[PDB]
Amino acid sequence: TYQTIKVRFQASVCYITFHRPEANNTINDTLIEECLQVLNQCETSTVTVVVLEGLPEVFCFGADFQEIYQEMKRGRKQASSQEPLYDLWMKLQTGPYVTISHVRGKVNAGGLGFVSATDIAIADQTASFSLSELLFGLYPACVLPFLIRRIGRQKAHYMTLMTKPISVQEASEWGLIDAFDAESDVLLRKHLLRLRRLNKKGIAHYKQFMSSLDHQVSRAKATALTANQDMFSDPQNQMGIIRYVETGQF
Numbered sequence: 001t002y003q004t005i006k007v008r009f010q011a012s013v014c015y016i017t018f019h020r021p022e023a024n025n026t027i028n029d030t031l032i033e034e035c036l037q038v039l040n041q042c043e044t045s046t047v048t049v050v051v052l053e054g055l056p057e058v059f060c061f062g063a064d065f066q067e068i069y070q071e072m073k074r075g076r077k078q079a080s081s082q083e084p085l086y087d088l089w090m091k092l093q094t095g096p097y098v099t100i101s102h103v104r105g106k107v108n109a110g111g112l113g114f115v116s117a118t119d120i121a122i123a124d125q126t127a128s129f130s131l132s133e134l135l136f137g138l139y140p141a142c143v144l145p146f147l148i149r150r151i152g153r154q155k156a157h158y159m160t161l162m163t164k165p166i167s168v169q170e171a172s173e174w175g176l177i178d179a180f181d182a183e184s185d186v187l188l189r190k191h192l193l194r195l196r197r198l199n200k201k202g203i204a205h206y207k208q209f210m211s212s213l214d215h216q217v218s219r220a221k222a223t224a225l226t227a228n229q230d231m232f233s234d235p236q237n238q239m240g241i242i243r244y245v246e247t248g249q250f
Contacts, residue, residue, distance in 0.1 A: 004031040006054065007038055012114035012190075012196060014038065014047050014097075017054030025055060025139040026064035032084045048200045049192060050095075051110070053102040054113060062110020069245045072238070074084050076234050082142050084219055089117035089146055094211055096204030098195055102178065102188055103127045106138050109140035112217075116146035119207070121177040121193065123168055124184035130165035135249060137237040141227040173190060 006017040016038055018025050042050055053059070054084040056106065071080075092114070094097040101121035109131045115121045133139050141159060148156045149176040156243070169183055171177045231237055240250065 001075040002034045004033050005038070006082055009047065012047050013049045013051060013107055014042050015051045015053065018052070018060060019054060023064050023067075025058045025060045025061065025081070025111065026067070026186050027060065028064065028067070029080070029084070030089055035088055036084070036091065039088075039095060040117050042097055043095065046200070048097050048198060048203060049195050050092075050097050050099045051188070052100065052118060052191075055102075055104045055111075057100070058111070059103045059105060059127075060111025060114055061106065061108040061116060062112070065245060068196065068232070069242060072087070072242065079229050081225065082228050083225060085113070086225065089113050089142075090217060090221075092117040093146075093217065094207060095120065096200055098107050098203055100188070100191065101177075102184065104184065106130070109133055109143050112140065112213070113143040113146055115148050115177065116143065120191065122184055122187055123171070123180040124187075125168060125175050127168040127171065127177070127180065128165040129159075129171055130163070131160050132163050135163055136240045136244065138231050138232075139227075139242075141224045141231070142246055145217050146223060147150065147176070148216075167236075203243070 004006075004018060004020050006015075006019050008015040008017070016035065018024060018031070020028070020031065039050070043058065098120065099118040101118040103111075103115055103123035105128075106124050106125065107115060107129050112129060115129075123133065131140050144156060144160075155174050166174075166176075168177070168180050172180055178193075179187060243250075
């Protein structure tokens, strides 16, 4: 039945809605498992499209912080792997179905992983995207390979260094999102309308082909994960993250 998402099938489409309101659409470890589980059902079933949503004002911000701290004030000694999260985002790009992000509101590193990884990302006037991690000495290591595949190295670089959220317009110009509109529901339906017309078999073979042509994402996985461990095990980054979840930034 799921603790973090609301699943809803409709014909050949599957809707995954993130239902995590008290930790602002933040990512836990149960959420990752439930998604992998939903995607496996979509693996052989009759579904050809998977839609991600549930963001009246936030598709997903990113790695919960009070969690990264609360764990520290429990017994945390060395960071937790993000391999499951990374593989999930990889699945979105590789599975036998067209994945789509439906974004509304603020999205930070984390929701950014999701939007970047989906085969198609749509939004409305409200969507804004940001990477503030560098203010705390961190950086979206897991997100970056997916982001980079969409907008290029320079755009992802400027974004990370500048820390300021970008508009839905720039996201569009950069390739972060394909199509956006004030009526992003109608816009979604126009996409689903065209997507049905495709069959699971052609989609799966087509996506497999694109995957073999480009190993960029998989090739960077260990480096990203190695970097994730490291930046989180580094003292200073830690106190920075800590000294903030109580007081200042620096």
